[PDB]
Enzyme design. Structure first.
Site, PDB file in Angstrom:
ATOM      1  CG  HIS A 125      -0.514   0.338   2.504  1.00  0.00           C
ATOM      2  ND1 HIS A 125      -0.074  -0.226   3.754  1.00  0.00           N
ATOM      3  CD2 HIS A 125      -0.279   1.694   3.154  1.00  0.00           C
ATOM      4  CE1 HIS A 125       0.562   0.050   3.979  1.00  0.00           C
ATOM      5  NE2 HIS A 125       0.319   1.378   4.363  1.00  0.00           N
ATOM      6  CG  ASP A 128      -0.179  -3.763   2.918  1.00  0.00           C
ATOM      7  OD1 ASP A 128       0.054  -3.477   1.702  1.00  0.00           O
ATOM      8  OD2 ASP A 128      -0.164  -3.339   4.234  1.00  0.00           O
ATOM      9  CB  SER A 134       2.249   1.663   6.167  1.00  0.00           C
ATOM     10  OG  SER A 134       1.601   1.900   7.044  1.00  0.00           O
ATOM     11  N   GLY A 135       4.749  -0.322   5.975  1.00  0.00           N
ATOM     12  CA  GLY A 135       5.771  -0.926   5.158  1.00  0.00           C
ATOM     13  C   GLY A 135       7.738  -1.059   6.396  1.00  0.00           C
TER      14      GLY A 135
HETATM   15  O1  LIG Z   1      -4.446   4.141   7.818  1.00  0.00           O
HETATM   16  C1  LIG Z   1      -4.902   3.516   8.331  1.00  0.00           C
HETATM   17  N1  LIG Z   1      -5.092   3.560   9.540  1.00  0.00           N
HETATM   18  C2  LIG Z   1      -5.020   5.096  10.399  1.00  0.00           C
HETATM   19  C3  LIG Z   1      -6.868   5.600  10.732  1.00  0.00           C
HETATM   20  C4  LIG Z   1      -6.295   7.078  10.844  1.00  0.00           C
HETATM   21  C5  LIG Z   1      -5.172   7.252  11.657  1.00  0.00           C
HETATM   22  C6  LIG Z   1      -4.162   7.033  11.732  1.00  0.00           C
HETATM   23  C7  LIG Z   1      -4.188   5.611  10.571  1.00  0.00           C
HETATM   24  S1  LIG Z   1      -2.592   4.794  10.791  1.00  0.00           S
HETATM   25  O2  LIG Z   1      -2.213   4.667   9.521  1.00  0.00           O
HETATM   26  O3  LIG Z   1      -1.480   5.707  11.182  1.00  0.00           O
HETATM   27  N2  LIG Z   1      -3.100   3.737  11.584  1.00  0.00           N
HETATM   28  C8  LIG Z   1      -1.717   2.438  11.862  1.00  0.00           C
HETATM   29  C9  LIG Z   1      -0.615   1.717  10.817  1.00  0.00           C
HETATM   30  C10 LIG Z   1       0.418   0.602  11.215  1.00  0.00           C
HETATM   31  C11 LIG Z   1      -0.403  -0.116  12.623  1.00  0.00           C
HETATM   32 CL1  LIG Z   1       0.892  -1.809  13.112  1.00  0.00          CL
HETATM   33  C12 LIG Z   1      -0.950   0.670  13.752  1.00  0.00           C
HETATM   34  N3  LIG Z   1      -1.353   1.870  12.854  1.00  0.00           N
HETATM   35  C13 LIG Z   1      -5.911   2.267   8.425  1.00  0.00           C
HETATM   36  C14 LIG Z   1      -5.778   1.404   6.579  1.00  0.00           C
HETATM   37  C15 LIG Z   1      -6.647   0.546   6.371  1.00  0.00           C
HETATM   38  C16 LIG Z   1      -7.510  -0.157   7.078  1.00  0.00           C
HETATM   39  N4  LIG Z   1      -8.322  -0.810   6.481  1.00  0.00           N
HETATM   40  C17 LIG Z   1      -8.188  -2.716   6.898  1.00  0.00           C
HETATM   41  C18 LIG Z   1      -8.798  -3.332   6.048  1.00  0.00           C
HETATM   42  C19 LIG Z   1      -9.916  -3.258   5.038  1.00  0.00           C
HETATM   43  C20 LIG Z   1      -9.720  -2.241   5.273  1.00  0.00           C
HETATM   44  C21 LIG Z   1      -8.935  -1.116   5.393  1.00  0.00           C
HETATM   45  O4  LIG Z   1      -9.006   0.265   5.676  1.00  0.00           O
HETATM   46  C22 LIG Z   1      -8.069   0.813   8.753  1.00  0.00           C
HETATM   47  C23 LIG Z   1      -6.958   1.437   8.347  1.00  0.00           C
END
Ligand SMILES: O=C(Nc1ccccc1S(=O)(=O)Nc1ccc(Cl)cn1)c1ccc(-n2ccccc2=O)cc1
Lengths: 234, 52
Positions: A42, A88, A185-186
């Site tokens: 992604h 992913d 991420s990644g």
């Molecule tokens: O971007 C997302 N999250 C987010 C949201 C608001 C603010 C900050 C963050 S963050 O991106 O900062 N969070 C993270 C990223 C890594 C880890 Cl290990 C922990 N938290 C996110 C991405 C994909 C999904 N998802 C999963 C399955 C099907 C459809 C779908 O949409 C849910 C949410």
């Protein structure tokens, strides 16, 4: 990384950083060898043209240990979908080989069965990145790391509003305010065994960051070892 | 108990061939003479933090 600790000298040598046209990081990666980087599929949709920087710990100034590498070939899993975020994973072959040194070294790829029975069963893993330190904030200028507990697969499926596929696993805390975040991420999720660190996950997603009743979701590297070996040859 | 007993005394990978413990290592490491330890081949073997 919300919470956790700063990566001290030489502690996270396998961390890679994908930088856009503005030379700013938007995602992390894990160094697998002199020519390959592991990251999240992604992340490829976060910038048209991007490069990879290694050996960086502080994005503010150049110390002299950093190195930028252009990407030769991008290999993204064809099954990745934004609708589910399943599969992913992606591998990047670089145009020039990475020179290993202080703060620049590969993480080990483990064998499947051994990893699942010996690494995935450990109490904790380590996640790292230059991501936000709070759900609302700018990217951290310093590389951070965080010890995240492996989470029971059933407890996490119940706590998630999205389906956790077999290509995913959960790590982190139920209520404690520590977790990966936007920008991480990644990046690498590695598990230590006898002072040797093996790549076990790829930072994938999470509902917010470090939220009570919510965990960090990672791509299970063991579900793609064959795919990775293939990609590092094609 | 083989591999289940403290990773078969292996440094890294542990397998069972003919009901016996067999150790192995990641790329860049060679299995030591005792058939258990993993010896790096270069100054920057995988999985090792760089402290020097
Ligand atoms: O971007 C997302 N999250 C987010 C949201 C608001 C603010 C900050 C963050 S963050 O991106 O900062 N969070 C993270 C990223 C890594 C880890 Cl290990 C922990 N938290 C996110 C991405 C994909 C999904 N998802 C999963 C399955 C099907 C459809 C779908 O949409 C849910 C949410």
């Amino acid at each position: 990384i919300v919470g956790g600790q700063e990566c001290k000298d030489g502690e996270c040598p396998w961390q890679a950083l994908l930088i856009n046209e503005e030379n700013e990081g938007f995602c992390g990666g894990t160094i697998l060898s002199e020519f390959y980087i592991l990251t999240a599929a992604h992340c490829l949709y976060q910038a048209k043209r991007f490069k990879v920087r290694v050996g960086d710990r502080n994005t503010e100034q150049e110390e002299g240990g950093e190195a930028v590498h252009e990407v030769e070939v991008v290999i993204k899993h064809n099954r990745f979908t934004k609708e589910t975020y399943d599969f992913d994973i992606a591998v990047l072959r670089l145009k020039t080989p990475i020179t290993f040194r202080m703060n620049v070294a590969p993480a080990c790829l483990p064998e499947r069965d051994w990893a699942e029975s010996t690494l995935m069963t450990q109490k904790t893993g380590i996640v790292s990145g230059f991501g936000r330190t709070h759900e609302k904030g700018r990217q951290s200028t310093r590389l951070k790391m965080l010890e995240v507990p492996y989470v029971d697969r059933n407890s996490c499926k119940l706590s998630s509003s999205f389906i956790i596929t077999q290509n995913m696993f959960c790590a982190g805390y139920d209520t404690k305010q520590e977790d990966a975040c936007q920008g991480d991420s990644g990046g690498p999720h590695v598990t230590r065994f006898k002072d040797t660190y093996f790549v076990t996950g790829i930072v994938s997603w999470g509902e917010g960051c470090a939220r009570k009743g919510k965990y960090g979701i990672y791509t299970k590297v063991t579900a793609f070892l064959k795919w990775i070996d293939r990609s590092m040859k094609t | 108990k083989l591999c289940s007993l403290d990773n078969g005394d292996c440094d890294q990978f542990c397998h069972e061939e003919q009901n016996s413990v067999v150790c192995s290592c990641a790329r860049g490491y060679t299995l030591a003479d005792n058939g258990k330890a993993c010896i790096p081949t270069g100054p920057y073997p995988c999985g090792k933090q760089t402290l020097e």
